[PDB]
Write a protein that binds this ligand. Structure first.
Ligand SMILES: [Zn+2]
Ligand SMILES: [Zn+2]
Ligand SMILES: [Zn+2]
Length: 87
RNA sequence: GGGCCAUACCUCUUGGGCCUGGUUAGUACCUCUUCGGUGGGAAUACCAGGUGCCC
């Protein structure tokens, strides 16, 4: 069990990444920063940063075997599907 | 149409994907270590909640 030792706090968490998540509130700064070249986004949780990393990985089409499009963001893939795989 | 880049989608059900909490577990595994200590950190299984926001 990992405990916050902020003044008069004493809150306890199952895992240290949750403890770091909690202390980020007292500090009012975000712990999980994107390390990609040219990026500066920061997130409240590791899973949220992990999800953000998918933005740099892209969103490749799989609606058809003869497709090859990769979207720079989740929206661009969803918009591509509606236009290129409507039926 | 743009920004955040799925709590956004998928499927039509109290479901999948993604998100959060309690348990298995900060255990197993892995970095550094004068072995006192340090940082990251599962899988597999069980239970509960959530399903876009801004211009
Ligand atoms: Zn605290
Ligand atoms: Zn980034
Ligand atoms: Zn396509």
């Amino acid at each position: 069990m990992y405990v916050c030792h902020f003044e008069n706090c004493g809150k306890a968490f199952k895992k240290h990444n949750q403890l770091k998540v909690h202390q980020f509130s007292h500090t009012q700064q975000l712990p999980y920063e994107c390390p990609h070249e040219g990026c500066d986004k920061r997130f409240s949780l590791p899973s949220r940063l992990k999800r953000h990393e998918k933005v740099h990985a892209g969103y490749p089409c799989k609606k058809d075997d003869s497709c090859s499009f990769v979207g720079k963001t989740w929206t661009l893939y969803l918009k591509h599907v509606a236009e290129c795989h409507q039926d």
